[PDB]
Amino acid sequence: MKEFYLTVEQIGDSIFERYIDSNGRERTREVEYKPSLFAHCPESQATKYFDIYGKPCTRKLFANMRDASQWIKRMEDIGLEALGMDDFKLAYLSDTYNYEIKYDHTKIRVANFDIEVTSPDGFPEPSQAKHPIDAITHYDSIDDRFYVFDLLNSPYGNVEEWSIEIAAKLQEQGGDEVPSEIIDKIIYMPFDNEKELLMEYLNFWQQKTPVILTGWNVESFAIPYVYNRIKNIFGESTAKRLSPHRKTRVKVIENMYGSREIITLFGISVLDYIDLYKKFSFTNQPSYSLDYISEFELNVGKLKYDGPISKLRESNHQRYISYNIIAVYRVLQIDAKRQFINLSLDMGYYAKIQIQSVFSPIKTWDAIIFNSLKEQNKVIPQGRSHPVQPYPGAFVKEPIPNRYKYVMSFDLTSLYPSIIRQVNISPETIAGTFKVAPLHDYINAVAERPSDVYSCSPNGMMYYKDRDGVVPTEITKVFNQRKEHKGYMLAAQRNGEIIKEALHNPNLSVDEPLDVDYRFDFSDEIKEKIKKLSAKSLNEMLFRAQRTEVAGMTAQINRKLLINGLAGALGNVWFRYYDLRNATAITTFGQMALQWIERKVNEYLNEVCGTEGEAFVLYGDTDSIYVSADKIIDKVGESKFRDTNHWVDFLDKFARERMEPAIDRGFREMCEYMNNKQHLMFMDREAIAGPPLGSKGIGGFWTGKKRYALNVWDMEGTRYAEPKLKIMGLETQKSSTPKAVQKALKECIRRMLQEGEESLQEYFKEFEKEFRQLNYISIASVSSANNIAKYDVGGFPGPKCPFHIRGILTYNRAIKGNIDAPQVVEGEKVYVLPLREGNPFGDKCIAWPSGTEITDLIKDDVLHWMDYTVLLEKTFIKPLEGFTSAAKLDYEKKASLFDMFDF
DNA sequence: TCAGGTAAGCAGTCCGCG
DNA sequence: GCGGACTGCTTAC
Ligand SMILES: Nc1ccn([C@H]2C[C@H](O)[C@@H](COP(=O)(O)OP(=O)(O)OP(=O)(O)O)O2)c(=O)n1
Ligand SMILES: [Ca+2]
Numbered sequence: 055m056k057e058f059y060l061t062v063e064q065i066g067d068s069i070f071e072r073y074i075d076s077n078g079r080e081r082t083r084e085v086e087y088k089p090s091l092f093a094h095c096p097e098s099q100a101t102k103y104f105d106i107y108g109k110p111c112t113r114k115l116f117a118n119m120r121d122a123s124q125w126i127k128r129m130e131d132i133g134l135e136a137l138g139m140d141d142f143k144l145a146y147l148s149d150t151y152n153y154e155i156k157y158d159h160t161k162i163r164v165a166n167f168d169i170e171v172t173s174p175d176g177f178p179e180p181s182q183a184k185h186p187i188d189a190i191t192h193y194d195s196i197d198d199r200f201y202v203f204d205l206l207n208s209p210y211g212n213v214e215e216w217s218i219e220i221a222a223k224l225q226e227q228g229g230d231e232v233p234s235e236i237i238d239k240i241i242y243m244p245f246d247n248e249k250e251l252l253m254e255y256l257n258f259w260q261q262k263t264p265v266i267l268t269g270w271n272v273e274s275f276a277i278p279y280v281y282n283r284i285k286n287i288f289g290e291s292t293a294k295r296l297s298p299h300r301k302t303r304v305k306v307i308e309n310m311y312g313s314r315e316i317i318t319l320f321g322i323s324v325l326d327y328i329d330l331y332k333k334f335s336f337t338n339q340p341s342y343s344l345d346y347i348s349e350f351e352l353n354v355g356k357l358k359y360d361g362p363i364s365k366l367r368e369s370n371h372q373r374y375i376s377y378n379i380i381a382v383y384r385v386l387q388i389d390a391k392r393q394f395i396n397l398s399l400d401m402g403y404y405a406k407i408q409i410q411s412v413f414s415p416i417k418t419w420d421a422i423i424f425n426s427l428k429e430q431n432k433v434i435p436q437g438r439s440h441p442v443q444p445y446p447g448a449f450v451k452e453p454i455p456n457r458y459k460y461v462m463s464f465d466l467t468s469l470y471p472s473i474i475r476q477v478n479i480s481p482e483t484i485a486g487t488f489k490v491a492p493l494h495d496y497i498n499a500v501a502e503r504p505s506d507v508y509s510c511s512p513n514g515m516m517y518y519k520d521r522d523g524v525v526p527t528e529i530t531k532v533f534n535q536r537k538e539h540k541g542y543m544l545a546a547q548r549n550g551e552i553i554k555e556a557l558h559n560p561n562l563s564v565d566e567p568l569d570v571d572y573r574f575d576f577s578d579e580i581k582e583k584i585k586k587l588s589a590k591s592l593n594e595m596l597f598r599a600q601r602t603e604v605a606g607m608t609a610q611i612n613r614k615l616l617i618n619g620l621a622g623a624l625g626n627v628w629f630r631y632y633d634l635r636n637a638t639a640i641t642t643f644g645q646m647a648l649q650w651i652e653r654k655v656n657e658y659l660n661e662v663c664g665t666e667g668e669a670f671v672l673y674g675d676t677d678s679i680y681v682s683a684d685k686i687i688d689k690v691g692e693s694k695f696r697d698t699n700h701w702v703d704f705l706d707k708f709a710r711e712r713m714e715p716a717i718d719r720g721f722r723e724m725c726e727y728m729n730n731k732q733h734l735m736f737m738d739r740e741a742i743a744g745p746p747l748g749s750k751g752i753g754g755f756w757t758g759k760k761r762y763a764l765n766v767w768d769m770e771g772t773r774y775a776e777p778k779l780k781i782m783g784l785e786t787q788k789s790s791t792p793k794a795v796q797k798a799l800k801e802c803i804r805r806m807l808q809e810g811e812e813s814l815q816e817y818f819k820e821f822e823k824e825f826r827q828l829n830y831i832s833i834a835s836v837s838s839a840n841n842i843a844k845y846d847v848g849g850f851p852g853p854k855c856p857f858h859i860r861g862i863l864t865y866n867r868a869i870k871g872n873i874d875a876p877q878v879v880e881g882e883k884v885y886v887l888p889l890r891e892g893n894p895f896g897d898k899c900i901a902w903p904s905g906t907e908i909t910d911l912i913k914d915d916v917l918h919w920m921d922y923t924v925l926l927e928k929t930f931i932k933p934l935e936g937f938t939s940a941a942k943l944d945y946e947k948k949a950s951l952f953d954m955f956d957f
Numbered sequence: 958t959c960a961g962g963t964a965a966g967c968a969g970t971c972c973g974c975g
Numbered sequence: 976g977c978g979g980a981c982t983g984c985t986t987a988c
């Protein structure tokens with residue numbers, strides 16, 4: 055077995071490394087690593103080090119790391135470039151692990167924990183840590199055990215021991231329903247005092263020192279609280295035992311509105327699961343409480359308790375501890391699904407970085423590129439200071455707002471990375487510039503050919519064609535990994551649809567799910583067996599298929615994020631290879647590609663339809679085109695089709711056999727025009743959309759840029775058992791839109807697209823009639839809340855006060871002088887409700903923390919003064935009016951001469 | 958909201974628009 | 976009332 059690092063730190067002139075040795079044991083070592091840096095030289099031909107531009111360099115080997123850093127300073131004082139990896143631990147890892155790291159996750163100690171702290175006077179601030187820690191549950195991945203540390207005696211109450219027997223029981227037996235599958239994995243330790251609890255926890259920590267430390271808000275709450283509480287009680291040296299190297303640092307985290315403090319534990323990699331989720335889940339949520347996210351991800355019920363959490367330990371210590379345990383498990387369950395820890399380890403070891411650096415695409419790419427170049431004895435340039443400057447991005451076509459009955463979409467594969475590879479865009483491949491014409495001249499192929507020697511982008515940049523740049527080389531490797539995982543994801547998706555189809559005809563038998571790999575398309579034999587299965591077995595298979603799809607999605611979408619992040623890093627001032635010429639070369643080439651192919655598709659379809667100057671491409675954004683297919687369908691005639699699937703098959707064939715070849719030819723011509731290194735503009739059919747055959751559905755509509763809805767039957771080769779609504783940008787997709795309103799608007803859209811005007815009018819009438827019954831949370835708006843202080847003038851709205859902030863100030867006056875009332879946290883999200891004229895709150899709206907019930911102090915008054923009329927017009931009617939006007943439809947039946955008779 | 962990028966939509970404030 | 980300038984917040988890509 056090859057060795058692999060666990061953590062790496064620089065402390066003074068020493069590297070501290072925890073690692074798994076060749077025998078599979080965890081070890082720690084201190085290494086007086088001597089770094090090398092580089093300087094340009096005339097020079098001797100006997101040097102083997104060259105910078106990325108091929109200029110010779112001499113290697114300077116330093117007695118220690120502090121000397122290397124001081125040399126970098128002097129080179130700045132002199133005014134000369136100091137070359138090489140200035141983050142010495144990355145250099146250390148590169149030297150020590152000079153091969154593709156093969157890691158064994160079963161040897162990596164992954165800990166997730168959660169603490170409880172009873173506090174009668176508001177939120178227990180981690181910086182103060184003035185209240186006892188009264189529960190800790192710490193799950194260890196190697197032991198596969200939940201270690202529970204329970205405080206029985208506190209200034210806030212003495213309690214009895216937690217009972218595992220009651221914990222296991224149904225809530226209907228008076229129990230806590232701790233999942234039976236973890237009951238035998240709980241190791242319960244009660245303590246008669248907090249000093250002994252904390253001393254034992256530290257001893258335990260020493261024995262089972264986390265490598266990866268996770269949980270929910272551990273970086274912002276649990277770690278700082280534990281550290282500071284131990285500091286308060288025992289002193290600093292004891293608190294630093296949370297670090298395997300006894301080194302910690304208060305770190306100030308800054309943003310534009312203010313700052314906060316965290317504790318850096320040297321020799322541990324903290325991956326707070328809230329931040330993993332925010333980065334990798336590709337959701338935007340109304341609330342990020344563990345309860346809310348658990349319900350969203352796992353469909354588990356809210357953990358129910360009576361009274362405030364500040365009195366939960368005293369009133370029901372049994373439930374208090376059970377819910378602490380369950381909280382830790384819910385994070386494990388989310389990870390079992392989303393696999394963000396796996397992803398982080400995968401990417402971290404690939405790049406050869408501290409695992410926690412996966413949060414930084416810039417740090418990730420710096421290490422990948424450094425390691426690649428080092429292999430060639432090439433020397434990386436010094437990072438430089440650059441002023442932040444705006445630069446142009448993608449093209450978006452202005453659509454004509456309308457209904458669109460039949461639509462086929464086409465999309466470029468991994469556009470920006472494909473552009474980088476096609477054009478050969480890299481720091482070291484810049485060949486020069488050419489004289490640019492207006493972009494429209496390149497789009498229309500009337501501008502002079504930029505170069506007969508070099509590979510070009512319409513921003514005026516030229517690149518070498520003799521060899522691949524390091525950016526193209528390394529981006530290709532990750533692109534290839536992404537493609538493999540996307541393949542598994544789509545197969546799992548297709549397999550899921552086979553199971554859905556079979557669920558129409560389930561067998562009345564007792565059987566088991568098939569043991570299959572959902573990452574590969576089901577064979578004919580598997581399909582035959584599926585048709586013979588019970589509903590229970592099919593549903594279990596569907597769950598597993600959907601879990602496989604989620605696993606593939608995590609692996610693929612985040613590799614996509616990383617590669618797109620390299621294109622973005624070229625436009626970030628902190629990136630070692632920051633260059634607006636390269637960043638703009640990518641974006642400007644993309645603008646041309648989209649508009650180039652729009653023209654080619656229009657020309658092609660006008661030719662096949664025998665028309666002149668008709669717009670077949672109705673819309674496009676960045677790298678996709680949406681093509682009106684009404685004329686194609688009408689050329690055979692709707693009456694000629696047996697069913698919906700029949701015209702779907704037909705459009706699918708037309709897209710693949712006629713349109714994609716035309717698109718390919720168009721892009722090959724563009725490649726030769728720009729004299730690019732390799733043709734990589736691959737534009738495949740994405741969606742096939744239309745109304746059900748024989749229906750009055752409108753199929754799709756656009757209201758404007760980034761705002762459209764389509765009834766989709768096939769997506770990237772997945773033929774759905776039921777048509778799928780693809781809605782982009784509209785209020786149904788916005789976290790700010792109330793939950794019940796998202797749901798109602800989506801149904802309005804479904805009816806528009808699938809059923810027609812009359813169906814839409816029927817639903818609207820009913821929703822308008824009944825909406826006042828809806829639960830207040832489901833009809834509250836949601837917003838992030840920044841600069842509460844800025845707009846606060848003696849508890850009242852200052853000039854230009856945003857609506858949601860006004861709501862917070864209303865709330866703040868209403869709960870004033872109440873220490874136990876939930877506080878709105880700056881930078882987090884709130885529910886917002888409008889209030890009727892003459893309410894006791896003294897203003898037109900109120901806001902409270904999102905994901906929560908509003909305090910019982912004011913709940914009744916809020917419910918009584920809720921402005922349902924304003925709520926409805928603003929969140930429901932106004933957006934619907936936008937949808938319907940765009941689609942040339944009415945949500946309310948217009949009067950006609952026909953109505954009425956029947957006397 | 959510490960942590961790659963730009964384009965661009967809508968809510969709301971403030972106030973003009975004879 | 977609607978739009979323009981502007982802030983705030985949110986999506987699409
Ligand atoms: N978060 C994002 C998403 C998009 N884009 C840019 C880079 C993409 O290449 C391009 C098109 O976005 P897509 O969503 O269509 O994604 P890709 O084309 O990269 O991947 P694919 O279509 O293969 O899934 O827009 C970006 O810079 N950052
Ligand atoms: Ca808790």
Ligand SMILES: [Ca+2]
Pocket residue numbers: 465466467468469677
């Ligand atoms: Ca794409």
Ligand SMILES: [Ca+2]
Pocket residue numbers: 465466467738739740770
């Ligand atoms: Ca595709």
Ligand SMILES: [Ca+2]
Pocket residue numbers: 556559560561584585586587
């Ligand atoms: Ca069957």
Ligand SMILES: [Ca+2]
Pocket residue numbers: 465466677678
């Ligand atoms: Ca796209």
